[PDB]
Amino acid sequence: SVVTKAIVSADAEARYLSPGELDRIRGFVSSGERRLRVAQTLTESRERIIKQAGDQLFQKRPDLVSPGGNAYGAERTASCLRDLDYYLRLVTFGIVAGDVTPIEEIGVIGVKEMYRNLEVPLPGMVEAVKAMKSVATGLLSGDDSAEVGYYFDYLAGALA
Amino acid sequence: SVVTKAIVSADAEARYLSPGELDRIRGFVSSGERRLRVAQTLTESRERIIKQAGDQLFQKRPDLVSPGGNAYGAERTASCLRDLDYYLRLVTFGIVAGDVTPIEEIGVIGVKEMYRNLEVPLPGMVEAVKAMKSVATGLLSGDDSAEVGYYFDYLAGALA
Amino acid sequence: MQDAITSVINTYDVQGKYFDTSAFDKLKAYYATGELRVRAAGTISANAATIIKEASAKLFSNQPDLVRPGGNAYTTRRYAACVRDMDYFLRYATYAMLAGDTSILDERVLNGLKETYNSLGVPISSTVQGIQAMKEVTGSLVGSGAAKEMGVYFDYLSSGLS
Amino acid sequence: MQDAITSVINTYDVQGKYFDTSAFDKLKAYYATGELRVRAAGTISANAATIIKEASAKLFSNQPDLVRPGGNAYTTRRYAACVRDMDYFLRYATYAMLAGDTSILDERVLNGLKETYNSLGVPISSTVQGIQAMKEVTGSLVGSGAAKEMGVYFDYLSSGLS
Amino acid sequence: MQDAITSVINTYDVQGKYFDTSAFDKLKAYYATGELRVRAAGTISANAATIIKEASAKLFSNQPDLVRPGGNAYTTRRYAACVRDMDYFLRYATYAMLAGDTSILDERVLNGLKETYNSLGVPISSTVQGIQAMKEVTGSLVGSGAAKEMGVYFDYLSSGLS
Amino acid sequence: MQDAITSVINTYDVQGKYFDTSAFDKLKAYYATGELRVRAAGTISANAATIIKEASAKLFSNQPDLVRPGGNAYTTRRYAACVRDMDYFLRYATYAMLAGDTSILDERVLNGLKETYNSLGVPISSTVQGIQAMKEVTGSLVGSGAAKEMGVYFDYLSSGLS
Amino acid sequence: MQDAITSVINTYDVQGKYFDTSAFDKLKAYYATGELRVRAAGTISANAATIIKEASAKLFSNQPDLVRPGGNAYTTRRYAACVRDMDYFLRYATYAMLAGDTSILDERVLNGLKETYNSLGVPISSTVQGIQAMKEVTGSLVGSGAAKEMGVYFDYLSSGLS
Amino acid sequence: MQDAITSVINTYDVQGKYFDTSAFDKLKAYYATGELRVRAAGTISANAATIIKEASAKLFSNQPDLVRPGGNAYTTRRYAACVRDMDYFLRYATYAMLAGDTSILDERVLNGLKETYNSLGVPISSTVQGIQAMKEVTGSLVGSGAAKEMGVYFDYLSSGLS
Amino acid sequence: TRLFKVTALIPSYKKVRGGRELQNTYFTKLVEYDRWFAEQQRIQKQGGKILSVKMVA
Amino acid sequence: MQDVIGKVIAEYDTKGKYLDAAALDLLRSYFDSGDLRLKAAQAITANAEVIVRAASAKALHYTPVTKPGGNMYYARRYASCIRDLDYFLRYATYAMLADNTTLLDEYVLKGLTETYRALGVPLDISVRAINALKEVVAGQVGPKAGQEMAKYFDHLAKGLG
Amino acid sequence: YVKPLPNQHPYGSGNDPLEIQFGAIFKSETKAPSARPAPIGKDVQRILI
Amino acid sequence: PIKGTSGSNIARPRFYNTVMVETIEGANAEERYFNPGELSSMAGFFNDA
Ligand SMILES: CCC1=C(C)/C(=C/C2=NC(=C\c3[nH]c(/C=C4\NC(=O)[C@H](C)[C@H]4CC)c(C)c3CCC(=O)O)/C(CCC(=O)O)=C2C)NC1=O
Ligand SMILES: CCC1=C(C)/C(=C/C2=NC(=C\c3[nH]c(/C=C4\NC(=O)[C@H](C)[C@H]4CC)c(C)c3CCC(=O)O)/C(CCC(=O)O)=C2C)NC1=O
Ligand SMILES: CCC1=C(C)/C(=C/C2=NC(=C\c3[nH]c(/C=C4\NC(=O)[C@H](C)[C@H]4CC)c(C)c3CCC(=O)O)/C(CCC(=O)O)=C2C)NC1=O
Ligand SMILES: CCC1=C(C)/C(=C/C2=NC(=C\c3[nH]c(/C=C4\NC(=O)[C@H](C)[C@H]4CC)c(C)c3CCC(=O)O)/C(CCC(=O)O)=C2C)NC1=O
Ligand SMILES: CCC1=C(C)/C(=C/C2=NC(=C\c3[nH]c(/C=C4\NC(=O)[C@H](C)[C@H]4CC)c(C)c3CCC(=O)O)/C(CCC(=O)O)=C2C)NC1=O
Ligand SMILES: CCC1=C(C)/C(=C/C2=NC(=C\c3[nH]c(/C=C4\NC(=O)[C@H](C)[C@H]4CC)c(C)c3CCC(=O)O)/C(CCC(=O)O)=C2C)NC1=O
Ligand SMILES: CCC1=C(C)/C(=C/C2=NC(=C\c3[nH]c(/C=C4\NC(=O)[C@H](C)[C@H]4CC)c(C)c3CCC(=O)O)/C(CCC(=O)O)=C2C)NC1=O
Ligand SMILES: CCC1=C(C)/C(=C/C2=NC(=C\c3[nH]c(/C=C4\NC(=O)[C@H](C)[C@H]4CC)c(C)c3CCC(=O)O)/C(CCC(=O)O)=C2C)NC1=O
Ligand SMILES: CCC1=C(C)/C(=C/C2=NC(=C\c3[nH]c(/C=C4\NC(=O)[C@H](C)[C@H]4CC)c(C)c3CCC(=O)O)/C(CCC(=O)O)=C2C)NC1=O
Ligand SMILES: CCC1=C(C)/C(=C/C2=NC(=C\c3[nH]c(/C=C4\NC(=O)[C@H](C)[C@H]4CC)c(C)c3CCC(=O)O)/C(CCC(=O)O)=C2C)NC1=O
Question: Starting from the edge strand earliest in sequence, which strands make up the sheet with I3-9, in order?
Fold first, then answer.
């Protein structure tokens, strides 16, 4: 998280935390309640985001569900939905932590190798994450929507 | 052997064997029958090759048989015939192996110190192995002599 | 190496489930303690040199043989090593204070220190006494609320090296 | 890198006492023996290659099974290691003789040597025989006065190996 | 690299002066534009791959000899290298826009670039065309004021290469 | 030497493109500020000697050791060279302001100036102080806007020297 | 400068030695090659404008970026500079070929050319390409025997630049 | 580096067209000498030390001043460096012969050779003489047909030096 | 206080490596006393685990 | 590391005599089988990714190890498992070409079990993955080469197991 | 990279002779490289003493 | 504008690998001559060419 990164930076050159690191930690903890409220809203309605994003992705890329596609089949579609659920949970984790370190550490480092093993088209990741971002930003207010969409943006860039 | 060198080279770059290294191995295995036949052809005439090499060695360098030399005396001849036998055996091992490595470990790594201790001149070694080269290349066919000469004068160059 | 937030993220991620309400309550706890933690961290950063001063002074006062010949602190090099160890312990205790978790202590302090001291022959009891000496004075400067909260990390270091 | 001069300082510093008359006498002893130590070291360094020659010749004459195939010394590489080990034994014996203390032997030769030789299949008793062949030629060359001093180190290596 | 704040600090430090009214006015001007810069940077990080796609398409359409045999983009290897260079330019121009100063551009991109391309054979003019194309592509996505601010740094890159 | 117009012409010739709307916009901005530039240049030319007089008076009052024996401006020769250098800086700052581009400063003023002064022994810091005093004097005569304009070139010279 | 005859003379002068069989062999070699060298020199003098013509055209055809806007050879001034440099290269290669020695190339051309080109921003890869262009253009005109002789001097120029 | 195959492939790839009659002729000529060149390379790789011996003997017999005091080859270190350089030249000539292209020579010998020898004071003419002696010995060793193929690259190196 | 025999396992958390790096992860070295503090700190910052350290001399 | 050639040369060096008829027979048995070994090696080289992918799928994909709480659950951890399967395939190919398992024992199994214990890697699931890779390789390369490659995969399995 | 142009000949520092009474002594690119190229433009006017 | 320049060399990017270039660079990387395996491979390459 934010305090984790500050502590790592301070310990890297073997010193106590800089005043700037203390200010960034204060800024993090001061906005912790709003982050937890965003976590409320995203966690409660998870089904809406996941299903609407799946529908938007499948409409945008019909070849995925078409025969010969990676998502073709009921089990493969279920795996698609489970992957979207994983990424939504990680986005909520990063929202709470104040950094994208949970998203990265859990499901970004080595994501390309895994999806190469699965033949998963990374543009499919990008479009699914963009649909998730659209739904999440729609269900939130503007001040929250921008900050939340930043995390989806980072995830999409990591997949792309 | 050639296969071991190719595998080591491939492991150095963390990659599968290249088609150049692959058809190197292909030529190595396709030439196996000729190399084994050559190795035997050296083997039957071991005593002949060693005695003729010793004779040519005395003729080229009388100093070894001259008074005050390191090889002077009758007792030194028993070791001379046996050491030329070792080096011919190493040459055959290198022939079957397809490279100069078995010769390297068995008789080259540490030969300089080994003859420094015994006060053996390197030129005596190079002339003796040149004598074995001449005798063997006389016995073998031209195509086989071309391949075996490399091992022989490699031993010569390594001895000095 | 993880704080309270990443610790709860890990314990909820390993189960594969989303955050529950109890997780949110635990998170509100740390967010509510954050400003006190940062204030204590600033105080300790300001007073680290003085804390080392008085902690080394008290440790060498109660145990006189350590500085005297034949002691496990009797050398200029060895004295510097002891004070360096105490300074590192203080800094990592403050780190764990800010993070709210003792994982950093395991990953960056107790990782190989126990057997290093065992091989070197450093007495465990003297090290625990030094940790106590630093804790009971640092708690005085940081305030009672932050005193009780550095208590867990300092006696964690003591029990780990024990 | 232990020496008698260094040893007395270490002892007085660990027990925290100034110079005594015993240290005075032993430092005189070391300084007085120093010149004969110098001449012994120079004579051995003069004939180190010849000493290794004679020792290797005696060992290989006593037990030729090593040089012949199937022996631990049957390879130019293995023969190189064979003579290198003798050269190291001679050199470190001279180092101990100049030092006057056998701690250098324990620190840089003996510790782990038995296990390493057993792992690599090196015969211990053959190496002891080589050390004995080395010590007899060294004692012949240096003379009885320096032979007595060189004898204790060679015996110490032989006992450590066994 | 240095940003606007660091630039003002350096200018006032080399003169040995405190901040006057002009300094605080300039710092306030930079602070007023911070949120716009952050929003523009987020928007660019949103569509970086997109902007690269349209910029490369426009460049290779207007410069078709680049991808024909004899052109420096005629390979999948050389095509990937060109689009990675485009990625470099976009990333560092975004860094410069966020900082508010062109120092990072000169330090990490422009210094040594002409000689690098001269060694590699890369056409400088075509790279300038690609940078300009990136500028028109980015301006529409970022809006009017963000386009003015962001195109200042693209113009700096083009002039440095020019 | 290049002004704003020449800079636009070159940045369009390097591309090979003709003029489009953006170039005409930049040229229009330069013509918009041209009247201010001409008035400031005429005012500075009318009062160059006066500006040098108060600037040198302020510098030598703030640093009296310069004109005292042992100072670099202690001689009629060296004092004259000093006020000559001050006239250089004023005149070329006026040139750069009238051109709207700092190219002439790098091009005819700051190139090899550090090496020249270091070979002569001229204090660089005191020359920068003279430039700043000249800035302060020039600003009051040229007015607020023209002072803000001339300040960028004076600061450019001061940062180039320092 | 230095030719083959002068080279042999200087070698024997520094040795203080007399012309031996080897010296007269080298002199005979040069006199044998002399008529071919003179014919090649006359041919190259006849067609020097044509050689520069064709080599420039081919170099700018293989690398058309040079003559398009933004290229190092894009202006009348810079194009004429390129042609002037190529005319030097041809004339001095002809001098070296007629002399039979590359000392003239070293001292008159290659001593300082890299730094001149690096300061000017001139691409050195493209200059080597232009030298190779002149090489294989003049090879056709002089004939295979004379081409084999002039090629070594062209390669000497190229290696000096590279 | 490059070989004949890479050169032809690139020549026809930049044009964007398949191999014509001249291409197939170049490849057939390159392949025809392939077995002869590989035989010569095996001979040289097997007998490099011998070739160095006769080459150095001829060079130092023709120019005894090199190995006498005051000569560049007068010490054990400088003699070893001389013969090491000769081994370099032989090995890289073998590489160039097998490749069929002089690109490897320009890349990995000539690039920095003149700087090295002018910094160290090595006589370039004597190095050329040593290279010629090496050419003669290796030609006598590998046969006339392979002697010409060795000699072309030996001449390339000699012309690069002088 | 001469030497330390240290066995430690530093895993990889930042990326996935294609080369071997097996001996780079799990290893035992002898570390000098003056260097052991810095080496232990480096192993700890890398995220690795120091399995055991013994005293050699 | 040694091959069959190096092994027989080492044995006849230690015993101290030349290569006899039996050594020739073993060397011929290695040489004539060479063409099959290179065909198998080329087939694995061309289709290594497909082999590892199919093996990982059938052995691991829908097992609990991929789900959270398992050792494979992360992008980094899943990529690491696929990377280790790549290791096994490549080094089994190397051992097959060398016709000796000492390469597998040394390059791969030296300290691997301790690393897997410390990291938390399950050994039994690794054995299952190596086995599945073995049948995938056998299916792709045919029965003759599959039998040879099964020996090296089984050597890996018993090394971990 | 962070400073103005040096006092240098426009074609490099090796183009500047030592200001001695006679001799024409220049730095050589090859005996010791010691070569500093500077992007000195065509309108740069050198500062002479 | 750039305040300083480091100079321009002639880069040799690698487009792809040939069998001959691969063998020669394998020999050169170890700063050695060709072993019998490399010689045999090159002879076979010239035979199949
Ligand atoms: C939290 C970190 C993490 C992630 C992200 C992860 C992704 C993941 N998705 C998988 C399957 C899958 N994933 C997808 C979804 C993709 N294919 C379609 O084309 C779509 C474009 C796209 C969805 C938007 C599909 C179709 C499968 C089934 C493939 C198969 O089983 O062969 C698998 C194979 C194992 C299994 O399904 O149990 C993994 C490991 N695993 C992790 O431990
Ligand atoms: C396979 C690796 C290997 C080699 C090569 C080897 C050679 C070898 N030759 C030896 C003796 C010797 N060998 C020679 C023969 C040579 N010395 C003279 O300078 C002549 C130039 C030349 C004969 C013409 C001599 C003179 C001795 C010393 C006494 C003796 O004859 O046994 C010895 C010492 C003990 C013994 O006789 O076995 C060795 C180890 N041993 C090995 O394990
Ligand atoms: C960041 C976590 C961490 C720490 C703190 C750490 C300390 C540490 N202390 C050491 C020795 C030492 N450590 C101490 C301190 C102890 N002895 C007594 O004074 C006290 C009871 C006690 C201090 C509380 C001393 C005196 C030495 C030197 C003794 C010797 O030379 O053997 C060493 C051996 C290497 C060296 O000193 O150069 C280390 C690595 N290592 C780590 O990875
Ligand atoms: C610091 C001082 C020091 C010591 C004490 C030392 C002992 C030592 N002996 C070794 C091997 C060896 N040592 C010997 C010598 C023995 N075997 C022969 O039969 C003789 C009876 C006897 C000699 C008197 C041999 C033959 C080997 C080779 C074993 C092998 O190849 O694995 C090795 C491993 C090196 C290798 O195998 O390449 C060590 C470390 N090394 C040192 O640096
Ligand atoms: C052998 C080595 C090699 C090949 C073949 C190659 C193909 C290639 N074709 C391209 C253009 C293109 N290529 C195509 C499609 C064609 N592409 C073919 O695979 C189809 C047969 C066919 C359509 C059915 C199109 C439509 C474009 C225009 C750019 C775009 O797709 O947006 C490009 C992008 C550069 C450009 O815009 O011109 C590449 C890299 N690159 C290489 O280094
Ligand atoms: C060694 C060579 C040398 C000389 C000659 C020299 C003269 C000199 N006189 C100065 C001031 C002055 N000098 C005078 C002298 C004038 N008052 C009357 O009008 C007279 C006509 C005339 C004298 C007879 C005055 C009045 C000032 C004060 C100017 C002021 O502060 O406004 C100053 C300005 C700096 C300072 O006050 O210390 C200099 C440099 N400096 C030198 O380094
Ligand atoms: C911006 C300053 C500038 C100019 C003006 C310029 C002119 C220029 N004219 C060229 C050729 C040419 N120029 C002309 C034009 C002539 N033909 C008739 O005789 C007319 C009298 C006359 C035109 C009115 C022609 C026909 C060629 C082609 C010659 C050839 O290809 O060999 C080329 C060579 C193109 C190349 O190598 O790719 C250049 C660079 N270059 C510059 O950097
Ligand atoms: C393949 C690429 C390559 C080349 C070409 C090369 C040449 C080279 N030769 C050197 C030394 C030397 N080279 C020579 C050359 C001999 N002097 C005699 O007079 C002869 C004329 C001449 C040979 C026939 C000498 C005498 C030295 C030692 C000079 C000294 O260090 O003072 C050095 C200095 C580094 C060292 O001493 O190890 C280099 C770089 N190095 C390379 O990596
Ligand atoms: C070439 C010889 C070689 C081997 C064999 C090898 C194994 C190996 N696997 C590792 C990590 C790993 N390996 C695995 C795979 C395991 N988890 C799955 O469930 C399976 C049961 C099983 C594999 C079949 C995983 C999940 C990790 C990551 C563990 C972690 O970092 O926490 C690591 C730590 C370094 C890294 O993460 O990059 C090594 C050294 N490395 C080598 O250089
Ligand atoms: C007035 C200040 C000044 C000095 C002194 C000076 C020295 C000087 N001496 C030179 C030549 C020379 N100078 C000497 C003298 C030396 N070599 C002998 O061995 C003697 C031991 C020793 C004299 C005692 C020699 C032999 C040369 C000829 C070198 C050559 O021309 O290459 C040259 C080359 C230019 C020319 O000869 O016209 C200069 C510049 N230059 C100056 O501007």
Answer: I26-32, I3-9, I49-55
